[PDB]
Amino acid sequence: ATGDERFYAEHLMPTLQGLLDPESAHRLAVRFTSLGLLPRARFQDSDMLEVRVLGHKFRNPVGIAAGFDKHGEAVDGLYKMGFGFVEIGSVTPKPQEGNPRPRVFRLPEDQAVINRYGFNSHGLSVVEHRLRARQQKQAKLTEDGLPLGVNLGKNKTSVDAAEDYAEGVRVLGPLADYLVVNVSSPNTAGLRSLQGKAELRRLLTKVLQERDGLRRVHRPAVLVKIAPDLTSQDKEDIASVVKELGIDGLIVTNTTVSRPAGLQGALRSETGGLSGKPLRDLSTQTIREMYALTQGRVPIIGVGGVSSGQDALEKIRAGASLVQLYTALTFWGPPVVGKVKRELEALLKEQGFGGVTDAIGADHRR
Ligand SMILES: CCn1c(CO)nn(-c2cc3c(cc2F)c(=O)c(-c2ccccc2C)cn3C(C)C)c1=O
Ligand SMILES: Cc1cc2nc3c(=O)[nH]c(=O)nc-3n(C[C@H](O)[C@H](O)[C@H](O)COP(=O)(O)O)c2cc1C
Numbered sequence: 001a002t003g004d005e006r007f008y009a010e011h012l013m014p015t016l017q018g019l020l021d022p023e024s025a026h027r028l029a030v031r032f033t034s035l036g037l038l039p040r041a042r043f044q045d046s047d048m049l050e051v052r053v054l055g056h057k058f059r060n061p062v063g064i065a066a067g068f069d070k071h072g073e074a075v076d077g078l079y080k081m082g083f084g085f086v087e088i089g090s091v092t093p094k095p096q097e098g099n100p101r102p103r104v105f106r107l108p109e110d111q112a113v114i115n116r117y118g119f120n121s122h123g124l125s126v127v128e129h130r131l132r133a134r135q136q137k138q139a140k141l142t143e144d145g146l147p148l149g150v151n152l153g154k155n156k157t158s159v160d161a162a163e164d165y166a167e168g169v170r171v172l173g174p175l176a177d178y179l180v181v182n183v184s185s186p187n188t189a190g191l192r193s194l195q196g197k198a199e200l201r202r203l204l205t206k207v208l209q210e211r212d213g214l215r216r217v218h219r220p221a222v223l224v225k226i227a228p229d230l231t232s233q234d235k236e237d238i239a240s241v242v243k244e245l246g247i248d249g250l251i252v253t254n255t256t257v258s259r260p261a262g263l264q265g266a267l268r269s270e271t272g273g274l275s276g277k278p279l280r281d282l283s284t285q286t287i288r289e290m291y292a293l294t295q296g297r298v299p300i301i302g303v304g305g306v307s308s309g310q311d312a313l314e315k316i317r318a319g320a321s322l323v324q325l326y327t328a329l330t331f332w333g334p335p336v337v338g339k340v341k342r343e344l345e346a347l348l349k350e351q352g353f354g355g356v357t358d359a360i361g362a363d364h365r366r
């Protein structure tokens with residue numbers, strides 16, 4: 001453990017979180033990050049951590065999950081933190097305010113957060129112009145193994161969900177290495193119903209037709225991000241649709257509307273999605289089941305409760321090609337990224353893996 005990891009986790013982050021309301025802490029973090037006001041990322045990515053998936057090289061398999069940088073304000077600062085890839089969003093077609101404040105709640109006794117932001121978004125036009133200002137910088141970053149994902153949502157009052165996603169593909173698809181069809185926010189009424197078989201097949205057919213209409217150098221991979229709260233039937237249906245349509249990958253998982261037994265935080269009964277440690281094993285077991293249902297043929301980005309190399313490797317061995325985190329960054333701060341990478345490299349060597357690639361899905365081969 002570095003001096004920075006201990007100082008951030010034991011002193012700086014608890015002190016700052018104690019002075020700030022949770023949404024104010026989020027906003028200040030985006031500003032720090034966008035200005036590059038960050039501790040040194042001392043960790044040097046090794047060849048062991050490189051992954052080739054989704055038509056790209058990833059210098060390391062640890063990404064920032066959607067929700068931290070909803071509006072594409074802090075992309076370059078997130079690469080400076082040492083993330084191997086960045087996902088922005090969710091972005092909605094029109095700007096919208098989201099839910100009334102307060103709408104984010106800290107459960108420090110559980111190393112968890114509950115949020116009900118409700119897709120607060122600057123909207124596609126603002127984000128498009130923001131990404132266009134750095135489009136060639138991103139092309140060089142992607143060529144250097146640092147890809148960009150864009151996560152698409154839908155407006156609260158939209159009457160045609162598929163048209164909202166189609167608009168996102170047309171506007172931000174040409175600026176993305178991958179797009180995410182987010183059908184799993186717990187905080188937009190009716191959205192998770194889009195995970196059902198008939199609704200998902202119709203929606204994803206339209207999204208893929210729009211993506212296929214983009215010029216080759218502007219044609220991203222398309223992933224579907226799913227909930228941790230699906231029935232067995234829902235998961236079988238999603239696997240069937242993904243294989244039928246040739247969806248490029250899955251992001252597994254969004255936050256949970258469940259409240260696992262044992263939560264201690266005073267705010268455990270707030271409405272919204274739960275993230276962090278209580279989600280971890282529910283997410284890992286969703287990865288495991290989606291990998292099996294897709295015969296290991298569909299790349300998975302694993303997300304939910306990653307705060308250590310062990311957490312990352314458990315998702316990789318369950319079937320994830322890449323992992324993301326967000327909630328751990330709220331407790332540990334920026335040094336968590338190098339921590340996870342250093343611990344993951346050490347565990348791969350301890351378990352006899354030549355690299356990340358060799359470990360993907362390894363549990364299924366035991
Ligand atoms: C879920 C909403 N939510 C919360 C509340 O639940 N916190 N949070 C957050 C706060 C963060 C950070 C990262 C975060 F995800 C971070 O990385 C830093 C920080 C420290 C030193 C230097 C450079 C940086 C960027 C500072 N802060 C705050 C304390 C100001 C965040 O998104
Ligand atoms: C404050 C907050 C906002 C989020 N907003 C989004 C979002 O806009 N789109 C999305 O696909 N996921 C969103 N998520 C979910 C995360 O991307 C991630 O799937 C989930 O938090 C689990 O990872 P974690 O336990 O590492 O935080 C959000 C999560 C948090 C904590």
Ligand SMILES: O=C(O)c1cc(=O)[nH]c(=O)[nH]1
Nearest residue numbers: 117118119185187255273
């Ligand atoms: O904006 C939100 O409320 C939100 C979206 C999402 O996909 N996941 C989440 O936890 N919150």
Ligand SMILES: [Cl-]
Nearest residue numbers: 076079080081
């Ligand atoms: Cl960088």
Ligand SMILES: [Cl-]
Nearest residue numbers: 022104105106
């Ligand atoms: Cl709080």
Ligand SMILES: [Cl-]
Nearest residue numbers: 122123125126
């Ligand atoms: Cl806009």
Ligand SMILES: [Cl-]
Nearest residue numbers: 135174175218
């Ligand atoms: Cl373009």
Ligand SMILES: [Cl-]
Nearest residue numbers: 208209212246
């Ligand atoms: Cl296609």
Ligand SMILES: [Cl-]
Nearest residue numbers: 177217219220
């Ligand atoms: Cl592309």
Ligand SMILES: [Cl-]
Nearest residue numbers: 230231232233
């Ligand atoms: Cl079930």
Ligand SMILES: [Cl-]
Nearest residue numbers: 257258259260
């Ligand atoms: Cl529950």
Ligand SMILES: [Cl-]
Nearest residue numbers: 257270271272
């Ligand atoms: Cl809820």
Ligand SMILES: [Cl-]
Nearest residue numbers: 310313314347
């Ligand atoms: Cl392990």
